[PDB]
Design an enzyme around this catalytic site. Structure first.
Site, PDB file in Angstrom:
ATOM      1  CG  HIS B 134     -17.125   4.313  29.034  1.00 23.96           C
ATOM      2  ND1 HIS B 134     -16.272   3.260  28.786  1.00 23.96           N
ATOM      3  CD2 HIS B 134     -16.526   5.068  29.983  1.00 23.96           C
ATOM      4  CE1 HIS B 134     -15.207   3.368  29.560  1.00 23.96           C
ATOM      5  NE2 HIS B 134     -15.336   4.458  30.296  1.00 23.96           N
ATOM      6  CG  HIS B 135     -13.492   4.592  26.343  1.00 22.50           C
ATOM      7  ND1 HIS B 135     -13.661   5.690  27.158  1.00 22.50           N
ATOM      8  CD2 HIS B 135     -12.794   3.687  27.069  1.00 22.50           C
ATOM      9  CE1 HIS B 135     -13.086   5.462  28.325  1.00 22.50           C
ATOM     10  NE2 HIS B 135     -12.552   4.254  28.297  1.00 22.50           N
ATOM     11  CB  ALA B 136     -16.607   3.968  20.244  1.00 19.33           C
ATOM     12  CB  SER B 142     -12.035   5.530  21.422  1.00 20.63           C
ATOM     13  OG  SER B 142     -11.349   6.071  22.536  1.00 20.63           O
ATOM     14  CG  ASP B 175     -14.063   8.774  26.223  1.00 19.16           C
ATOM     15  OD1 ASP B 175     -14.944   7.937  26.500  1.00 19.16           O
ATOM     16  OD2 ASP B 175     -12.994   8.476  25.652  1.00 19.16           O
TER      17      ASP B 175
END
Ligand SMILES: [Zn+2]
Ligand SMILES: [Zn+2]
Ligand SMILES: [Zn+2]
Ligand SMILES: [Zn+2]
Ligand SMILES: [Zn+2]
EC number: 3.5.1.98
Lengths: 318, 368, 132, 104
Positions: B134-136, B142, B175
């Site tokens: 869930h970050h890239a 990321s 993010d």
């Protein structure tokens, strides 16, 4: 070839993964419904998807570390972007690269003939623009550099400072702890403005204490719960309580900003005479000729507020 | 409920390791799988091995240059790859290992197939712990994440459902997923995370969304070491209000082990049942579910957590005693199935939480 | 691969890039006691042992399914062969296999045996250390 | 500007010397406030009569030893601002010019 003689080299355990206990660690780290094999069959390859069918350690221009295209004629180090023109590192020149100063010193710099070259360039520009002819000639002898302010525009404002590599920096850059509620210079508690308490709780019952940040500008104590906040401000900018002027207004758009801090040598304070109606900016003082700060005569603030509310009433009243 | 639960697992996900000291190991997926299998749960789910995704499907959200660089980069060919390494943040935080492309393809294929199965109606419960990066966000690796297959899952669900709801419970804010739907009103991202000087740093309370995604993004700022009794209290009312008001057709949940008590990087004080409370409450509404697995770097804990959750979704409560899995040594002195919270002091005061409730519900008062 | 609906529902105008949200200062991590660090060290050593053993076992099974066929998921085996043939001869031997399977298979089995023995001894050590 | 512990810049002939304030004099009460403070004039502490009745201050000159502490009133102790720094630099430059004239 027979076998890999250099088989076991090293592992995370420090041992080559093929030795085992490491007896020193043994003494240190001691005291004295079927299995998964059935998954090969009940796994069905599902592909029902709707889209299944598809020298120096700094740049000589930026004075920063990073990618360096160093030279040999002159021991200089440049960033690839910090170069005129900016060269792509993918397509390397693959040859002897010299700085602009090195190029001038090799091709042109005959100890006496340089005067001949500059004279020729001047006489090819004396009839034309000649005020810039000297500069136009000379800038061809210089290495590219990162643009910086000329050391005195900054000094015009005693509220700005240069960071580490040259960056902008201003006045807002910056278990159970009951001592946080103590002033320690007057022995008093930190009465938060919103809660009018310190909420110390107790050592016996730490679950009643309330955290305080004590705003970094006017040192007003505030609860993390009185104003919603998750954690303290420690790494980023200086925290400022909401009892401060906005210093920037977006009105519907239109933008307003307050002037910057200048040296009081160049500060031109001014006071009006009407004292009732005098349209001023936010640059007021409560008691090049462009940054005049009004001395507002505080009662004038009250007056100006009053008839302003009156006008806001009569716009909708009549 | 008695939901027909399908399940996905590739036997190649435990054979791709990160750096030596790197906290991200997918081996946790493999011992979680063994925990699921030796408990006899294999008779209650539909096990599958989804096809790995292709570049044309990652380019749906990611970029052609990014995917192309991913498919060719290698620890062997790294030294000539310098511009893309810095450009796409593929350096040290998200390192390059031997089977990065294979693992990303496996995770994306599994999650995209799970969304496909949810769409067709084969199962109302699809689970893929391999996904959950869930970050890239579409152009850069990321938070150890390289491919946000979650957005592919929501893309496929939206192909069938008018509204899809995304819930993030990882101590890290979602993010990339919230960014992917910051402007649209079809998807609500709701991230429960730690707010402070934390790695996400995003997820502010006043992040309701921009454009048409205004008031369609929920961020829950939390302080250190929240426990079950407080996490459930901050969890349930907001979920109730969203379901009653936004009323999604589909819904996606990110089940990261990072909020577990005593996580290698986590700082929350959630035990096993505090974590399972959220899963129970989510399954309490009946709409189809696509469970993924996000954070968590204590594999002995996240394996137990995931095994308990997959038992719970099938409406059964598993034994507290281990079925003698292969990796028995991992499970502590007692070899039980639970996560024991620590004695640390929870700082989440009720007043701050109440203000959070007030703000969130006032914002949601306009999402009939 | 971005479809029109993907162009519709996605967002490419607003990005956060937490470094921008972090004021370029950094992030504050959490405090962990030394016992937790020792647990992390033990967990890391366990994970390395088990990962090596599982990769070797998978390649061993694949080589068995190859050799039983020749008697008359694309990088695991190359990686484990290079690790076993760490003398940089793995590059040549991989292609030699692609065109010698039993000898590399038996070497892998021997390495598996030694690794499992060392893993058992280390499991004893790890458990003894952890229990306190 | 003028407070206990605060910096100050005081005249001394055609040049100024920066100092830090330690005692604040109150001529009305014949008393000074010091820091490690309601207390009368000290047994060994005294101020010149031209500054005993004015707002005098006990200051320590930085770069000078602790034995050069002086009682200077409002007459020479200026307000430490940008003008104060610019004017200190101005008289330092004038001292430099005087030295150069004495030399060249
Ligand atoms: Zn440079
Ligand atoms: Zn040169
Ligand atoms: Zn308060
Ligand atoms: Zn303030
Ligand atoms: Zn996480």
């Amino acid at each position: 070839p027979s076998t890999i003689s250099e088989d076991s080299k090293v592992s995370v355990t420090g041992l080559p993964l093929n030795k085992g206990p490491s007896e020193k660690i043994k003494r240190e780290s001691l005291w004295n419904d079927l299995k998964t094999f059935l998954t090969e069959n009940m796994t069905e390859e599902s592909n029902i998807r709707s889209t299944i069918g598809w020298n120096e350690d700094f740049c000589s221009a930026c004075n920063q570390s990073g990618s360096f295209l160093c030279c040999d004629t002159c021991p200089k180090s440049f960033h690839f972007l910090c170069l005129d023109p900016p060269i792509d590192p993918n397509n390397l020149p693959k040859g002897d690269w010299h700085c602009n100063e090195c190029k001038f010193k090799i091709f042109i710099n005959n100890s006496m003939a340089t005067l001949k070259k500059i004279e020729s360039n001047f006489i090819k520009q004396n009839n034309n623009v000649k005020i810039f002819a000297k500069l136009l000639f000379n800038i061809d002898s210089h290495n590219p550099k990162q643009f910086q302010l000329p050391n005195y525009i900054k000094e015009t404002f005693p509220a700005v400072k240069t960071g580490s590599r040259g960056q902008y920096s201003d006045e807002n850059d910056k278990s159970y702890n009951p001592d946080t509620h103590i002033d320690s210079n007057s022995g008093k508690f930190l009465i938060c403005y919103k809660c009018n308490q310190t909420r110390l709780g107790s050592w016996s019952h730490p679950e009643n204490s309330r955290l305080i940040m004590t705003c970094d500008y006017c040192q007003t104590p505030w609860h993390l719960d009185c104003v919603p906040r998750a954690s303290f401000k420690n790494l980023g900018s200086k925290w400022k309580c909401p009892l401060h002027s906005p210093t920037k207004v977006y009105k519907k758009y239109k933008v307003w900003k307050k002037q910057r801090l200048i040296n009081k040598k160049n500060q031109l304070y001014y006071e009006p005479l009407q004292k009732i109606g005098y349209q001023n900016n936010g640059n007021i003082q409560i008691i090049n000729q462009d940054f005049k700060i009004t001395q507002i005569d505080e009662n004038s603030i009250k007056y100006d507020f009053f008839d302003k509310i009156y006008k806001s009433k009569m716009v909708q009243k009549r | 409920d008695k939901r027909r639960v399908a399940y996905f697992y590739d036997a190649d996900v435990g054979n791709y390791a990160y750096g030596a000291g790197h906290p991200m190991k997918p081996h946790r997926i493999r011992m979680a799988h063994s925990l699921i299998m030796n408990y006899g749960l294999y008779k209650k789910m539909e096990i599958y091995r989804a096809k790995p995704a292709t570049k044309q499907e990652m380019c749906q959200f990611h970029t052609d240059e990014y995917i192309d660089f991913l498919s060719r980069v290698t620890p062997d060919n790294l030294e000539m790859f310098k511009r893309e390494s810095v450009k796409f943040n593929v350096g040290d935080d998200c390192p390059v290992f031997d089977g990065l492309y294979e693992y990303c393809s496996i995770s994306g294929g599994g999650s995209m197939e799970g969304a496909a199965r949810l769409n067709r109606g084969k199962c109302d419960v699809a689970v893929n712990y391999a996904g959950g990066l869930h970050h890239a966000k579409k152009s850069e690796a990321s938070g150890f994440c390289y491919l946000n297959d979650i957005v592919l899952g929501i893309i496929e669900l939206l192909r069938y459902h008018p509204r899809v709801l995304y819930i993030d419970i990882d101590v890290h804010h979602g993010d990339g997923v919230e960014e992917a739907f910051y402007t649209t009103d079809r998807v609500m991202t709701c991230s429960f995370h730690k707010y402070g000087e934390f790695f996400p740093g995003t997820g502010e309370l006043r992040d309701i969304g921009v454009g048409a995604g205004k008031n369609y993004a929920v961020n829950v700022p939390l302080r250190d070491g929240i426990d079950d009794a407080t996490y459930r209290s901050v969890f349930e009312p907001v979920i109730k209000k969203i379901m009653e008001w936004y009323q999604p057709s589909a819904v996606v949940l990110q089940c990261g082990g990072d909020s577990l008590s005593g996580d290698r990087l986590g700082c929350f004080n959630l035990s096993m049942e505090g974590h399972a409370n959220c899963v129970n409450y989510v399954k309490s509404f009946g709409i189809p579910m696509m469970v993924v697995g996000g954070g968590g770097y204590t594999m002995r804990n996240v394996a137990r957590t995931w095994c308990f959750e997959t038992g719970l979704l099938n409406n059964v409560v598993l034994d507290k005693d281990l079925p003698y899995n292969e990796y028995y040594e991992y499970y502590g002195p007692d070899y039980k199935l639970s996560v024991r919270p620590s004695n640390m002091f929870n700082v989440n005061t009720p007043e701050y939480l109440d203000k959070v409730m007030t703000n969130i519900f006032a914002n949601l008062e306009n999402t009939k | 691969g971005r479809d029109d609906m993907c162009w519709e529902v996605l967002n490419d105008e607003w990005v956060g890039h937490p470094v921008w949200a972090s004021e370029d200062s950094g992030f504050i991590a959490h405090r962990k006691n030394q016992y937790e660090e020792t647990l992390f060290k033990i967990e890391e050593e366990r994970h390395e042992y088990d990962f090596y053993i599982e990769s070797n076992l998978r390649t061993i099974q694949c080589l068995e399914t190859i050799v039983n066929k020749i008697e008359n998921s694309m990088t695991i085996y190359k990686k484990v062969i290079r690790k076993v043939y760490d003398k940089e001869r793995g590059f040549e031997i991989i292609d030699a296999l692609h065109e010698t399977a039993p000898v590399v298979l038996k070497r892998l089995k021997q390495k598996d045996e030694e690794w499992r023995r060392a893993q058992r001894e280390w499991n004893k050590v790890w458990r003894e250390l952890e229990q306190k | 500007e003028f407070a206990l512990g605060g910096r100050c810049l005081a005249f001394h002939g055609p040049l100024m010397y920066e100092a830090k304030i330690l005692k604040i004099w109150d001529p009305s009460s014949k008393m000074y406030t010091s820091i490690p403070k309601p207390q009368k004039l000290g047994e060994d502490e005294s101020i010149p009569e031209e500054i005993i009745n004015g707002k005098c201050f006990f200051i320590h000159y930085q770069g000078w030893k602790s034995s050069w502490d002086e009682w200077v009133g409002y007459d020479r102790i200026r307000a430490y601002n940008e003008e104060n720094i610019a004017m200190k630099k101005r008289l330092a430059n004038e001292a430099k010019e005087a030295k150069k004239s004495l030399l060249e």
